[PDB]
Design a protein around this motif. Structure first.
Motif, PDB file in Angstrom:
ATOM      1  N   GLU A   1       6.704  31.141 -22.687  1.00 52.12           N
ATOM      2  CA  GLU A   1       6.039  31.628 -22.166  1.00 52.12           C
ATOM      3  C   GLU A   1       6.852  31.778 -20.638  1.00 52.12           C
TER       4      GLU A   1
ATOM      5  N   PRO B   1      -9.425  36.290 -25.275  1.00 53.09           N
ATOM      6  CA  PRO B   1      -8.432  36.649 -24.483  1.00 53.09           C
ATOM      7  C   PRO B   1      -8.294  38.370 -25.587  1.00 53.09           C
TER       8      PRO B   1
ATOM      9  N   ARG C   1       2.397  37.944 -32.408  1.00 61.04           N
ATOM     10  CA  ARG C   1       2.408  37.849 -30.441  1.00 61.04           C
ATOM     11  C   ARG C   1       3.222  36.738 -29.998  1.00 61.04           C
TER      12      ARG C   1
ATOM     13  N   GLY D   1      -2.850  29.132 -29.826  1.00 62.43           N
ATOM     14  CA  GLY D   1      -3.715  29.211 -28.005  1.00 62.43           C
ATOM     15  C   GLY D   1      -4.462  28.787 -28.018  1.00 62.43           C
TER      16      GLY D   1
ATOM     17  N   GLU E   1      -1.677  37.093 -33.775  1.00 61.50           N
ATOM     18  CA  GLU E   1      -1.453  36.509 -32.638  1.00 61.50           C
ATOM     19  C   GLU E   1      -0.443  35.584 -33.008  1.00 61.50           C
TER      20      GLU E   1
ATOM     21  N   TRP F   1      -6.581  41.426 -24.992  1.00 63.81           N
ATOM     22  CA  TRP F   1      -6.351  41.532 -26.557  1.00 63.81           C
ATOM     23  C   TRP F   1      -6.429  41.666 -27.858  1.00 63.81           C
TER      24      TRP F   1
ATOM     25  N   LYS G   1      -3.789  38.169 -21.250  1.00 58.81           N
ATOM     26  CA  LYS G   1      -3.880  36.976 -21.672  1.00 58.81           C
ATOM     27  C   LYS G   1      -5.372  36.439 -20.949  1.00 58.81           C
TER      28      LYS G   1
ATOM     29  N   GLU H   1       2.372  28.446 -24.005  1.00 62.86           N
ATOM     30  CA  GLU H   1       2.515  28.083 -22.534  1.00 62.86           C
ATOM     31  C   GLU H   1       3.578  27.743 -21.262  1.00 62.86           C
TER      32      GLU H   1
END
Lengths: 194, 283, 203, 130, 176, 196
Positions: C11, E45, C64, E30, C61, E47, E12, C8
C-alpha cells in the motif's frame, strides 16, 4: 479519464513542442519594427523598408530575434504597457482577462525572451495579479454546486479555467461520495457518445 | 392531496355522497360544515392546513360519518417513517406502485414499466415513488369522470342474469383504461357506485360484465367479469368458466392470455355471437 | 518478511506512485512475491471448495489485494507511455550499483512502444517532407517530468537540516527540521532522495 | 468595454491624527520626484481652490491609507483638506488666508468603485465611487 | 486520489462485532481472525464487519471514541484552539459514515453523534482555507499541517498544489 | 502570415476536449505538405543563388522561410501525435475490440499502430505472473461486495460462465452474477449496475 493531453509549458523557460495549447497561444500577433530591408517577400505586407511597423505571430519573432536586434526590434502591446499595469494594481478582480487574452499569463511569460528593459516590472505584474485574483477562484469554485457556472467563468483565461475545472471536479466528487452515489459502476467514455 | 380532493375521489365516499349529481353534492358541503372545517382550509393541501384543525381530525370525521350512514370509515393499516419528512401509509405505496406499472403512455416493450416500478420500492429511489404519486393522482381524478359518465347516461344494461356496459373512444380519458389489468379496478369501482345508486332490488345483486376496445387494427375488445357485489361478498368469481364455455359454444376467436381467467380479448364482430350464447349459458 | 507485511509495504508503494511526479524506483521483489500468495491461495480454495462461507472471506481479501496491486501497475504504465524517451535514456546510461526505474518487462514494453510510434510517424508525415527534416529527435518533443511540484508528505524518520529554497535568491534559504509523524507541504525536488530511502511517504 | 480608469488605459502614450500626518507626508513629495510640490505651486500661480490627486500614487506610497480612504471617505476627506491648507501655509501664508477652505478632488483607478447608476447599490454608502 | 479510495484505505480500521454463527480461525494474508463463537465479541477489519452485517450475520458495536459526551468536548476543543487539533482516529469521517449508515440501530444516539462529527468537520475545513490563503497571500515556501487527516487533504489538495505550481513558475521566470 | 492551413488542423482538435476521436483529415494534411514542398524549393533556389552572385542581403528571406517550415512541421506532428492519444484510450475504456463507428474514423495506418500496441500490451500483461499473468485492464474501482446485480440493456448473443453454463441476455432482464465477470460489459454499455 485516460486521455491525458500534453500539458502547457507556457509558464516556464520554453513552451512544449506537442502541446495544442501553446501552439494556439503563440499564434497571437505582436508588433515589431524592422531593422533591414525584406527582399523577395514584400508581397505580404519586392522589398520592405527598414524602420517599418508590422504585426507578426509570436513564433515567427522567436528566430527572427537576436541580441543585437539584427533583423527587427519588438515593443510590447498595450496590455503589458505601463498604462494597464496600474489598472491591474487598483483591483485585479475586475478585469476581463478573457477579452484581454485569452492567454494572459501564457503570453506574458514569453515576452521575457525579448530582453526588454522593463522585464523586472512585467514579472511583478503577473505575480501580483495572479495573487490578487486567487481568493475569488478558490471560493467561487469550491462553493458553486449544481449552479449555472457559465457566469462565474466568463472572465477567466486558460490558466485559470483549468483551476476552476479542478475545484469543481473535487466538489462534485465529494458530494457524490457523501450521497452513496460513487459506488455504482458506470460507463466511462461511451456516455460521451450518447 | 387536499382533504377536499380526496373525499371527491375515494370510491367509498364518492358513492354514498353520490358526488356525481348536483342534488347530493350539497351533502358533502353539509358534512364539512358539521365539523367546523372552513371551506378555504379544506381546499388546500393537507401538509399546509392549519395546525389547530388537525388535532382530532380522525375522530371528528368518524363521528360525523355516523350521522350520514357511513360507519365503516376507520380501517387498520400500518405506516412508516424514515427521516424528517417521510411518512407513508401502507396504501399510498400501493397506489403509487400500481400506477407506475400501468402508466398509459408506453415507451417500449412490455417489460419497461415493470422495471421502473420494481425500482421504486427501495429507499434509495424516493424520487420515483414521489413521482408515481402524481400518476396515481391523475388516475383517480380520471376515474370519477367515467363512473360519472355511465351513471348520468345509464349505460349499465340489465341484459338478464348480469348487468352489462361498454365504452366509447370519443369520451376523453378512455385510452387510459386500454390495458387488460387497469380495467378490473374501474369495473370494481363502477359496481360499487352503481349498487349504491340504483333504486331496484334485482340489479343490486347481479354481477357485472364489462367490455372496452383493445386494438383498433385487429378490431378487438377486452372483457372482464366481477362477482355479485355486497358487503360480505365471499369473493369467489365464476366467469373463467362461463367465457370459456361460451366461446366454445359459439366457436369464435378468443384469447385467455393472462394468468387469471376472467379477462379475454374478443373480436369486435364476435361480440353479440358470444354474448347471446353466454346469456343462454348462465341462464 | 511475513506475508502480513508485504501488503503493508505494498500500500505504501502504491500511494507514492500515485502522487510522485516522476517514475519512482522499481520493486520487482514485491510484485513478484505477492503474485505468489495470490497464486497459492487460489489453489487452497479451488480444492477445499466444499465450504461456503470460508471461501467467501478469502475471495473478498484476494479481490482487495488484486486491486491494490493492479492499480499500482497501471499507474506506472502511464508514466512510461508519457515519458518513453526520457525513461529509455535514463536506463541506458545508468551507473552500475543504482536501482533501475524499469522492470525487465516494462523495458521491453517501452522499447516496443518507442519503436512502434517511430515507425508510425515515419510513414505518414515525416516521409513526404523535404529531405532534411525527415528526422525529428524525441528528446525535445516529449516534455520531461516536472520535479518542481508541491506535495503533501508525512515523515516517519526524524530528519534535520533540510534546505527550503523559496526563490532564486540563495540568501533567502532558511533550513528546517522535521519531527516524526508530522506532515508538510513542500516541493518535490528538495525531498527527492527521501522517498527512495523510505524516510517519508507522499500522502 | 469597461472604463476602469478616467485616463483611457489603452493608448495613454500616443485617531484623526494619523491620517492628517500621513497626508502631509504624502504631500511633501519632494524627496522622490517632486510631483506634487510641482502642482501646489502651479495652482497658487493660477488661484485655484482644489487640486486633483492620483490615488494610484497613494497606493504605491501607502496602501493602508489608500484603502481607508476609499471606504470611509468622509473622515478621510476632512483630514485631507486640513493637511492641505497646512501644506499651502507652508509655502505662502499670505495666500493661505485669501480662501476660506481648500478642496481636493480625486482621479485614478478605483477597484470595484467604477459603477454605473444602475449598479450603485446601498453597499456603497459613504464610499468614494466613480 | 478520490474519495472512493480513501474509503478503501479506511476499511482497514478494526471494529468489534458480535457474530451469530460458528466458525473457526481464518488465516488471512493480512493476519488472523476468530474464532467466531455465537454471542461473543470479536475484533475484525471494517470491510468484513460491514459485509457480514449486510448479510444479517452479526451486530456491530460503537467504537469507544464514538461517545456522545467525549465528542461534545472535542467539538469545543476544536473551536477554541487555533490550529489543527488531534482527532480520535485518522479516518473518523469514513467511520461515522459507514457505521451510522449500516448499523444505525445498534448505535444509541446516532443522530447526535452524526451532528457532532459534522460540526467538527465543518470547522477543520474552515481552518484549512485560512491556512491555504496565508500561504499564497504571503508567498511562503513551506507549511506545517499538524493533524490533518487524509480526507481533508484530499478534498482540496488537487487544487491547492496545482495552483501553487503555477505560482512557483510565475515567481521564478526572471532568473535566466 | 503563413501557416493558415496547418492552423485549421489544430483549431479543430481544440474544439473536442472530451477525448472523442474525430474523422481523419487527409485533405488538409496533403494541403500542408504541398506548401512545405513549395516553400522548400522556392527558398533553396535563392539559397544556392546567394552562393552564385553574392545576394547575401537575401539572408533574411532565408530565415523567414527556414523557420516558417518548422512551424508547419510542428503543427503536423502534434496533430498526428494528439490523435494517437485519443486512440490508446479506446483500449483502456472500450476493450480489445471496437465497433465500426470507431474503426471507420481512423486513418488506415492507425489501425496498424493500434494492433501493434494492443499486442505488445497483451504481451506484457501475460508476463507478470506464472500462470498467464494478471489482466490489469479490469479492476478500475475498489471492490465493494462480492456479487453484483446487473440488468441487461441490449441484446447480446449468449454470455458465458466459465463452467460452460451460458446465459442468454434479453432486454430488461436482471441477473445476479459475480462482478468478476460483469465489469467488461458494464463499462461498455450493455449491462447496468442497478442495486448500487
Amino acid at each position: 479519464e485516460a486521455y491525458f493531453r500534453v500539458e502547457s509549458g507556457a509558464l516556464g523557460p520554453e513552451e512544449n513542442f506537442l502541446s495544442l495549447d501553446d501552439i494556439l497561444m503563440s499564434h497571437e500577433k505582436l508588433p515589431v519594427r524592422t531593422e533591414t530591408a525584406m527582399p523577395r517577400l514584400g508581397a505580404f505586407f519586392n522589398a520592405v523598408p527598414q524602420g517599418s511597423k508590422l504585426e507578426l505571430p509570436l513564433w515567427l519573432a522567436k528566430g527572427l530575434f537576436d541580441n543585437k536586434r539584427r533583423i527587427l526590434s519588438v515593443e510590447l502591446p498595450k496590455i503589458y504597457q505601463e498604462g494597464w499595469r496600474t489598472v491591474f494594481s487598483a483591483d485585479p478582480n475586475v478585469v476581463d482577462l478573457h477579452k484581454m487574452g485569452p492567454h494572459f499569463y501564457g503570453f506574458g511569460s514569453q515576452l521575457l525572451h525579448f530582453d526588454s528593459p522593463e522585464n523586472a516590472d512585467i514579472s511583478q505584474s503577473l505575480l501580483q495579479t495572479f495573487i490578487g485574483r486567487f481568493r475569488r477562484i478558490m471560493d467561487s469554485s469550491q462553493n458553486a454546486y449544481n449552479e449555472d457556472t457559465s457566469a462565474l467563468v466568463a472572465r477567466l483565461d486558460e490558466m485559470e479555467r483549468g483551476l476552476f475545472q479542478t475545484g469543481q471536479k473535487g466538489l462534485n466528487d465529494f458530494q457524490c461520495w457523501e450521497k452513496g452515489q460513487a459506488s455504482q459502476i458506470t460507463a466511462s467514455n461511451l456516455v460521451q457518445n450518447y | 392531496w387536499s382533504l377536499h380532493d380526496s373525499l371527491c375521489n375515494t370510491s367509498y365516499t364518492a358513492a354514498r355522497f353520490k358526488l356525481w349529481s348536483v342534488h347530493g353534492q350539497k351533502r358533502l358541503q353539509e358534512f364539512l360544515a358539521d365539523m367546523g372545517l372552513p371551506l378555504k382550509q379544506v381546499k388546500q393541501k393537507f401538509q399546509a392546513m392549519d395546525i389547530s384543525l388537525k388535532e382530532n381530525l380522525r375522530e371528528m370525521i368518524e363521528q360525523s360519518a355516523n350521522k350520514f350512514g357511513m360507519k365503516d370509515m376507520r380501517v387498520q393499516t400500518f405506516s412508516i417513517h424514515f427521516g424528517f419528512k417521510h411518512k407513508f401509509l401502507a396504501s399510498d405505496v400501493v397506489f403509487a406502485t400500481m400506477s407506475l406499472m400501468e402508466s398509459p403512455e408506453k415507451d417500449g416493450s412490455g417489460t419497461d414499466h415493470f422495471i421502473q416500478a420494481l425500482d421504486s420500492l427501495s429507499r434509495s429511489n424516493l424520487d420515483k415513488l414521489y413521482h408515481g404519486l402524481e400518476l396515481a393522482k391523475k388516475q383517480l381524478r380520471a376515474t370519477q369522470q367515467t363512473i360519472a359518465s355511465c351513471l348520468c347516461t345509464n349505460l349499465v344494461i340489465s341484459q338478464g342474469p348480469f348487468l352489462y356496459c361498454s365504452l366509447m373512444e370519443g369520451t376523453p380519458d378512455v385510452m387510459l383504461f386500454s390495458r387488460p389489468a387497469s380495467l378490473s379496478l374501474l369495473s370494481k369501482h363502477l359496481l360499487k357506485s352503481f349498487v349504491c345508486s340504483t333504486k331496484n332490488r334485482r340489479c343490486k345483486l347481479l354481477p357485472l360484465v364489462m367490455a372496452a376496445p383493445l386494438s383498433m387494427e385487429h378490431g378487438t375488445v377486452t372483457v372482464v367479469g366481477i362477482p355479485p357485489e355486497t358487503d360480505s361478498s365471499d369473493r369467489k368469481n365464476f366467469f373463467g368458466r362461463a367465457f370459456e364455455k361460451a366461446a366454445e359454444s359459439t366457436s369464435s376467436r378468443m384469447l385467455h392470455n393472462h394468468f387469471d381467467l376472467s379477462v379475454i380479448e374478443l373480436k369486435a364482430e364476435d361480440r353479440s355471437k358470444f354474448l347471446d350464447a353466454l346469456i343462454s349459458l348462465l341462464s | 518478511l511475513t506475508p502480513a507485511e508485504l501488503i503493508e509495504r505494498l500500500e505504501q508503494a502504491w500511494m507514492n506512485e500515485k502522487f510522485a511526479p516522476e517514475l519512482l524506483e522499481s520493486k520487482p521483489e514485491i510484485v513478484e512475491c505477492v503474485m505468489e500468495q495470490l497464486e497459492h491461495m487460489e489453489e487452497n480454495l479451488r480444492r477445499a471448495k466444499r465450504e461456503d462461507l470460508k471461501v467467501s472471506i478469502h475471495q473478498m481479501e484476494m479481490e482487495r489485494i488484486r486491486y491494490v496491486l493492479s492499480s499500482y501497475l497501471r499507474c506506472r504504465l502511464m508514466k512510461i507511455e508519457k515519458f518513453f524517451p526520457h525513461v529509455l535514456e535514463k536506463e541506458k546510461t545508468r551507473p552500475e550499483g543504482e536501482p533501475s526505474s524499469l522492470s525487465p518487462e516494462e523495458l521491453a514494453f517501452a522499447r516496443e512502444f518507442m519503436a512502434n510510434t517511430e515507425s508510425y510517424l515515419k510513414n505518414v508525415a515525416l516521409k513526404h517532407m523535404p529531405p532534411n527534416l525527415q528526422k525529428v529527435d524525441l528528446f525535445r518533443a516529449v516534455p520531461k517530468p516536472d520535479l518542481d511540484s508541491y506535495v503533501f508528505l508525512r515523515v516517519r524518520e526524524r530528519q534535520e537540516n533540510i534546505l527550503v529554497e523559496p526563490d532564486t535568491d540563495e540568501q533567502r534559504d532558511y533550513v528546517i527540521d522535521l519531527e516524526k509523524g508530522s506532515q508538510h507541504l513542500i516541493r518535490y525536488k528538495t525531498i527527492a532522495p527521501l522517498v527512495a530511502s523510505g524516510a517519508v511517504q507522499l500522502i | 468595454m469597461l472604463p476602469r480608469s478616467p485616463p483611457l488605459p489603452r493608448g495613454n502614450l500616443w485617531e484623526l491624527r494619523e491620517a492628517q500626518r500621513d497626508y502631509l507626508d504624502f504631500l511633501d513629495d519632494e524627496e522622490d520626484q517632486g510631483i506634487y510640490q510641482s502642482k501646489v505651486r502651479e495652482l497658487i500661480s493660477d488661484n485655484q481652490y482644489r487640486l486633483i490627486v492620483n490615488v494610484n500614487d497613494l497606493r504605491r506610497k501607502n496602501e493602508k491609507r489608500a484603502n481607508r480612504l476609499l471606504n470611509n471617505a468622509f473622515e478621510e476627506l476632512v483630514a485631507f483638506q486640513r493637511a492641505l491648507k497646512d501644506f499651502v501655509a507652508s509655502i505662502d501664508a499670505t495666500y493661505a488666508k485669501q480662501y476660506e477652505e481648500f478642496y481636493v478632488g480625486l482621479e485614478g483607478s478605483f477597484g470595484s468603485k467604477h459603477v454605473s447608476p444602475r449598479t450603485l447599490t446601498s453597499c456603497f454608502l459613504s464610499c468614494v465611487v466613480c | 486520489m478520490d474519495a472512493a479510495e480513501v474509503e478503501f484505505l479506511a476499511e482497514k480500521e478494526l471494529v468489534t462485532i458480535i457474530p451469530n454463527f460458528s466458525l473457526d480461525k481464518i488465516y488471512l494474508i493480512g493476519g488472523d481472525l476468530g474464532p467466531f463463537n455465537p454471542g461473543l465479541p470479536v475484533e475484525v477489519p471494517l470491510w468484513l464487519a460491514i459485509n457480514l452485517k449486510q448479510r444479517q450475520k452479526c451486530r456491530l458495536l460503537p467504537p469507544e471514541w464514538m461517545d456522545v459526551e467525549k465528542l461534545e468536548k472535542m467539538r469545543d476543543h476544536e473551536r477554541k484552539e487555533e490550529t489543527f487539533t488531534p482527532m480520535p482516529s485518522p479516518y473518523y469521517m469514513e467511520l461515522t459514515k459507514l457505521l451510522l449508515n449500516h448499523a444505525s440501530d445498534n448505535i444509541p444516539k446516532a443522530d447526535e453523534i452524526r451532528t457532532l462529527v459534522k460540526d467538527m468537520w465543518d470547522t477543520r475545513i474552515a481552518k484549512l482555507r485560512v491556512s491555504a490563503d496565508s500561504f499564497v497571500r504571503q508567498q511562503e515556501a513551506h507549511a506545517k499541517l499538524d493533524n490533518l487527516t487524509l480526507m481533508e487533504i484530499n478534498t482540496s489538495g488537487t487544487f491547492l498544489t496545482q495552483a501553487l505550481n503555477h505560482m512557483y513558475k510565475l515567481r521564478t521566470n526572471l532568473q535566466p | 502570415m503563413f501557416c493558415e492551413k496547418a492552423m485549421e488542423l489544430i483549431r479543430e482538435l481544440h474544439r473536442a476536449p472530451e477525448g472523442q476521436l474525430p474523422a481523419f483529415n487527409e485533405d488538409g494534411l496533403r494541403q500542408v505538405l504541398e506548401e512545405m514542398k513549395a516553400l522548400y524549393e522556392q527558398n533553396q533556389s535563392d539559397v544556392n543563388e546567394a552562393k552564385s552572385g553574392g545576394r547575401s542581403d537575401l539572408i533574411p528571406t532565408i530565415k523567414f522561410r527556414h523557420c516558417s517550415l518548422l512551424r508547419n512541421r510542428r503543427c503536423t506532428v502534434a496533430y498526428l501525435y494528439d490523435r494517437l492519444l485519443r486512440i490508446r484510450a479506446l483500449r483502456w475504456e472500450y476493450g480489445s475490440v471496437l465497433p465500426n463507428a470507431l474503426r471507420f474514423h481512423m486513418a488506415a495506418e492507425e489501425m496498424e499502430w493500434f494492433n501493434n500496441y494492443k499486442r505488445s500490451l497483451a504481451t506484457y500483461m501475460r508476463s507478470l505472473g506464472g500462470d498467464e499473468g494478471l489482466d490489469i485492464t479490469q479492476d478500475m474501482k475498489p471492490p465493494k461486495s462480492l456479487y453484483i446485480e446487473v440488468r441487461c440493456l441490449k441484446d447480446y448473443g449468449e454470455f458465458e460462465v466459465d463452467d460452460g453454463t451460458s446465459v442468454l441476455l434479453k432486454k430488461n432482464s436482471q441477473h445476479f452474477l459475480p462482478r468478476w465477470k460483469c465489469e467488461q460489459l458494464i463499462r461498455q454499455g450493455v449491462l447496468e449496475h442497478i442495486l448500487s
